[PDB]
Amino acid sequence: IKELAVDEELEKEDGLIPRQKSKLCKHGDRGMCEYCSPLPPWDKEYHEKNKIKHISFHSYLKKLNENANKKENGSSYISPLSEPDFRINKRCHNGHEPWPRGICSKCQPSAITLQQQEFRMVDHVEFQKSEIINEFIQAWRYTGMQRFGYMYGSYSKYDNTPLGIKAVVEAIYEPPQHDEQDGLTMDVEQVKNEMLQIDRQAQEMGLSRIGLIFTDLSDAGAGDGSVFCKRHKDSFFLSSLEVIMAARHQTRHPNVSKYSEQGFFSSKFVTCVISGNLEGEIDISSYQVSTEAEALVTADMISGSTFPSMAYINDTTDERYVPEIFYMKSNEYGITVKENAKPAFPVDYLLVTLTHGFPNTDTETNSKFVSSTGFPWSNRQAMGQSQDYQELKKYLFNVASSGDFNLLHEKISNFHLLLYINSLQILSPDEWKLLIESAVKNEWEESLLKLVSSAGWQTLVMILQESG
Amino acid sequence: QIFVKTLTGKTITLEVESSDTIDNVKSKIQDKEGIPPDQQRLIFAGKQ
Ligand SMILES: [Zn+2]
Ligand SMILES: [Zn+2]
């Protein structure tokens, strides 16, 4: 099987950390005893020294390869990187062949200790431009209600975190949803039918749906104060209703891995939320879900509770056997061992954090999508920017009826403009594929003149001039 | 003109490895981790 091009590059590099000679070393200069030996990239002591709170899963893959492959014979190639299962094997390899009549300890799911995950799949989410997500908050500034979107992007290496993958996003697509002041809830059938055609155009453009965003602002008084502070240390970090939508999105998009026995493991999916800081701004934060316990129990046992920090655990009806969930908390006198014989266990423990950021404006490798970021989006029907062909006379117009190719190609690289053109499918699919590849790639000057000489682009500007 | 001989016996250990109270993890989430060089994080304003 074949993995991603980014995932195979992190596997080949060892990522060792070099050290220097010290006063504690008693050996010679041409050697190393223990104090200047090469440090492994999975040691968590070096991680918390530089305030890195997770061990960068590609290095966690290396720390399990040392346990799988040894100096001894072995002759196995097991590679035990699989999803730990809480479901019940029906055959059970014993005399209690039905679960209605019989269950023993080798098939019973053990009591969940609630230990936090030490490794994250995505180590650092990054963005492309501050003007891209400024249009997303501007949707709230016009209708006053919450929004929703899906992030399309790619992946590359990250040199800050040892053996880490960074998440790059390029554009944000919004599905048609019904907004509300308190929260939001849309139909999953019309979104999945709409997201199927966007994945078609994302393949030729080199994009993949790897993220989503949802807003939560609660403006205070619209004067000096920006927003309220809903999510803090004493309150919930992520609501339990949005854990369900984050869990189903990770199971729909698996990550291919040759080390896993099933063929897919350790999904690379980000969930970002606009919530605001403690003091005064609308700074965002992102956390992703845990694979070890939460990713498998969401198929059978997650039920909604009235508290945003916790989630209710329901009962067993003849196939849905669940084990007891335990966690430690302080009582009125001291700190005690596991107490939970009670439902509504918290879900903030099962989240691992990420580091969001925006790159510097002075230099970058590329940006690939900065045309205007002011074009009316596809499914923004709550706002007034959902126009017909009247907008195409205002937006591009083949500027001033005779456009220069340095000023014409800079507008054609928009994500939602190219996704609006092919829906009319005036051009051929072969000429459309070279149209979107010219706008997204470099050395575009020889191929842009091929587009203007084609009869399909001439019919597009002729059918636009007669219409309003 | 005689002797006294007696042996001994030991029990080594058991462990549980229980840690990570919930109040330490809630303080563990709300912090920062550092950002390379020019990876500003931004502010924003609106809703006049
Ligand atoms: Zn040494
Ligand atoms: Zn069994």
From Swiss-Prot, chain A:
State the Gene Ontology BP annotations: cytoplasm protein quality control by the ubiquitin-proteasome system; DNA replication termination; endosome to plasma membrane protein transport; ERAD pathway; mitochondria-associated ubiquitin-dependent protein catabolic process; mitotic spindle disassembly; mRNA transport; nonfunctional rRNA decay
Where, subcellularly, is it found? Cytoplasm, Perinuclear region; Endoplasmic reticulum membrane; Nucleus membrane
GO cellular component labels: Cdc48p-Npl4p-Vms1p AAA ATPase complex; cytoplasm; Doa10p ubiquitin ligase complex; Hrd1p ubiquitin ligase ERAD-L complex; nuclear membrane; nuclear outer membrane-endoplasmic reticulum membrane network; nucleus; perinuclear region of cytoplasm
Provide the topology term for how it sits in the membrane.
Peripheral membrane protein
The keyword Membrane belongs to this UniProt entry's keyword annotation: yes
Keywords annotated in UniProt? Cytoplasm, Endoplasmic reticulum, Membrane, mRNA transport, Nucleus, Protein transport, Translocation, Transport
Q: Which GO MF terms does the UniProt record name?
A: K48-linked polyubiquitin modification-dependent protein binding; ubiquitin binding; ubiquitin protein ligase binding
Please state every residue range assigned to the domain named MPN: 125-265
Q: What family does the Swiss-Prot or TrEMBL record give for this protein? A: Belongs to the NPL4 family.
Under the subunit heading, UniProt states:
Component of the heterotrimeric CDC48-NPL4-UFD1 ATPase complex. The CDC48-NPL4-UFD1 ATPase complex interacts with the HRD1 ubiquitin ligase complex composed of the E3 ligase HRD1, its cofactors HRD3, USA1 and DER1, substrate recruiting factor YOS9 and CDC48-binding protein UBX2. Interaction between the complexes is mediated by interaction between CDC48-NPL4-UFD1 complex member CDC48 and HRD1 complex member UBX2. Forms a complex composed of CDC48, NPL4, UFD1, DOA1, SHP1 and deubiquitinase OTU1. Interacts with CDC48, UFD1 and VMS1.
Comment field (misc) = Present with 1050 molecules/cell in log phase SD medium.
Q: So what does this one do?
A: Substrate-recruiting cofactor of the CDC48-NPL4-UFD1 segregase. Assists CDC48 in the dislocation of misfolded, polyubiquitinated ERAD substrates that are subsequently delivered to the proteasome for degradation. Involved in the import of nuclear-targeted proteins into the nucleus and the export of poly(A) RNA out of the nucleus. Required for the proteasome-dependent processing/activation of MGA2 and SPT23 transcription factors leading to the subsequent expression of OLE1. Regulates ubiquitin-mediated mitochondria protein degradation.
Q: Provide the protein name.
A: Nuclear protein localization protein 4
Q: Which organism is it from?
A: Saccharomyces cerevisiae (strain ATCC 204508 / S288c)
Originating gene: NPL4
Please specify the portion of the entire protein covered by the chain, as first and last position out of its full length: 113 to 580 of 580
From Swiss-Prot, chain B:
Changing residue 28 to R has the effect of: Deficiency in ubiquitin-protein conjugate formation
Q: Which residues form a coiled coil?
A: none
Residue span, Ubiquitin-like domain:
1-48
Compartments annotated for it: namely: Cytoplasm; Nucleus
Query: What does this protein do, in the record's words?
Result: Exists either covalently attached to another protein, or free (unanchored). When covalently bound, it is conjugated to target proteins via an isopeptide bond either as a monomer (monoubiquitin), a polymer linked via different Lys residues of the ubiquitin (polyubiquitin chains) or a linear polymer linked via the initiator Met of the ubiquitin (linear polyubiquitin chains).
Name of the protein in question: Ubiquitin
What species does this protein belong to?
Saccharomyces cerevisiae (strain ATCC 204508 / S288c) (Baker's yeast)
Which gene codes for it?
RPL40A
